[PDB]
Amino acid sequence: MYDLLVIGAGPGGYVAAIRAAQLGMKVGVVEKEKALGGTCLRVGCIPSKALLETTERIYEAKKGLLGAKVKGVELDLPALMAHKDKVVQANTQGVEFLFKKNGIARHQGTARFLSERKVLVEETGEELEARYILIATGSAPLIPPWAQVDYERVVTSTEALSFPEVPKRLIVVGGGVIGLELGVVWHRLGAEVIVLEYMDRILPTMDLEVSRAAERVFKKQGLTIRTGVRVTAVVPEAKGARVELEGGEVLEADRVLVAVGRRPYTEGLSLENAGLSTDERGRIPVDEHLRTRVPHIYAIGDVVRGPMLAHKASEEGIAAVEHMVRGFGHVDYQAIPSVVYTHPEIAAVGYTEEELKAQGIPYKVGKFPYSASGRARAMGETEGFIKVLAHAKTDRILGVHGIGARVGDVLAEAALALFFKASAEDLGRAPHAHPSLSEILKEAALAAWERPIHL
Template sequence: MAEEHDLVVVGGGPGGYVAAIRAAQLGMNVGCVDENEVLGGTCLRVGCIPSKAMLESSDLFHLAKKKFSGHGIKTGSVELDLPTMLARKERIVQIITQGVAGLFKKNGVTHYKGRGKLVAPGKVAVSSDRGEAELTAKHIILATGSVPTSLPGIEFDGDRIGGSTEALAFAEVPKHLIVIGAGYIGLELGSVWSRLGAEVTVLEYLDRILPGMDSEIAKEAKAIFQRQGLRFELGSRVTGAKAEGDQVTVTRDGADAIVGDRVLVSVGRKPNTAGLGLEEVGVKLAKRGQVEVDDAFRTSVEGVYAIGDLIRGPMLAHKAEEEGIACVEMIGTGYGHVNYDAIPGVCYTEPEIASVGKTEDELKESGVPYRVGSFPFAANARARVLTHTEGRVKILAHQETDRILGVHILGPRAGDLIAEAAVAIEFGASAEDIARSSHAHPTLAEVVKEAAFAVDNRAIHF
């Protein structure tokens, strides 16, 4: 006998579980299908959360070894206890994923553990080690996220060659970690193991790091990372990777091979559509494998919707959350909203890099007239106190209207500071609006205010 719901969500990651909770708040009878042992998707289980735990721990280790003495703190010998660090990461993941399960219980969302497959409009089959089940619902949201991609000639072996999941759980610090791809994941995890003592070489096919980020900010970030010890080989077309014993040889087109003991492949992700039954039911896919949807997240099959990494746009957890909420609100109330120009991206290196809106490169290409305001953290009192003075805030505003078009931050707590810029863009604020708003002193947020003043060439403290 089929279980009946108003809405069934397939996938329990940030997009899926948030959609399920919001739908329950709107009075819907909701079921959520997820095949993993715990809820939370890639982000909470083996992505965003564990990586940030390792970034925080490795940064503290680095500070204790290199920077505490400058604060008058004598620590003596500082030693790494990697098993304890990894165990801390796992405890954090456990607490947060259990929290999602608690939210399901609180909001009355029914959790089905198993693999969901769309078998017909309004029907989802759930396969698990306990057998088969069938769910029926007028509305079905597909939110199965994405999976890592690799390159021709490279196969993950779960040991010497792998993706971010493997790189979050190395049992020992690599002697030489080779990172393929200079995007967010590669730089974050490369930073982790570099701080813990590994030699790190980053190979990137393009002639720059952080594709899609403001090129001026990315260039400045690269110089900082190089001073930290990361080595970059740009313009590297990787053709293969082969493990032999405890070594891996990475081959490149037109360049010498590189030998290390671990390889992290971080060249991107692709929509996780395998086994979802999309083709059988008639859900249309785009050329790059994404599910095609309209502005209300409706697929080509009536009553079936898709959000998050399955569809167009950046593969970000918070983007999936916004889409999940908007999708169920459209279903339940007839209206939902996502402003894709106001979705920030953050790279949690040290210093952090955060961005929202248009880059200067995009404005130049599109011919939009703009002005630039920039202010360095080195001129900020709070940054001096924190001993984190590298980087700056860069604001792009329309030349004629002063409306903020993009904000790019390289510096301490950039991932937190970018929220002000996202709100400003969401509400159509001008650089003058930020400049005229009081910012507490002494705070890092004053750098944002000064950059806004700088758009009109009137920064106060620089």
């Protein structure tokens, strides 16, 4: 039998499988979709970043380039979508390559538990046994009952990656990362975009300061952002769709993207046959080693608690399989960055000010603006900042947060510093290339420690 059977071939599942193979396990993977790579590769991170990177270049050329006159920039939607598809194709084929290289067996079908040690692949009729089972079934779009999604006029993120033309009017229901990113993609191509959010801010996982800054920037760019608004219905119409709000207001658009969250996905898994159940939010409860209540069955990624991120899922996959083989594993949740791939980028790592205040932890704030950065100035960027939060007594970095050009790339270093349990002093004293955006992080760190040089 298998040593490890993995259900799902997303970031969590497929990386777990490769690591397990590296540890000497005989591994099988069941995935119901034809291509490997999960939500992230097929309809998530990869296609969305393809669209974001390319539209960003297009948008900047349309606004004008410093030192030049651009005579014309015409969207070529077939070419834009072809690039997206080619990037996805290359990535999924890469996972296939790595499975074959690492000797990982793959089954195509919906895995369903028969017992705690046996799983049916419903399509092939195969019954598979394993010593360890790793549930990595991911998530799915949350579709509230009031949202009548027809996958045409009222859509999820998947269809929003592939609109057959630019929507004259797009409404995004939900002010989270996914909807905002896709809102920006189509706004750059000429769509009038309106974002509706029930909560009193967008990007709720970010530090409040960063959420507020993000809203200002996107409004300046020309998106309409409306927080504190409860959508009561979304209904398709003949050649568009309407969005009803609490109080009677009705908005009309050509497409409406329903992006109010994602829910852990366990449909068709028959968890009950393994002696398992989901909690109130649909998650599979796990302990600190990612074991369910049945000790040889682990769960990771979007199907369990924690930030619904690809690299969160993969790190949990690594820790789970390392625990299976060695009896020890661990994920440093405080070193996992969360990034929004708009321009400017928006990011968070470690604790927000809100979380520190709630936990009663005393801290110092260090902040350095992009306006004081030589490199940012050189690029024609002036807006944004990075903020370092450090413990008031120990100087330990507790969190790093920012908004600005490439801030996600810059905060890669911040995540490393957190992983290294760095002090603000040590981050700020470390050499940083001049002139570079990393110097913004350096000065922010110095400011948290004591004082910066350049403020």
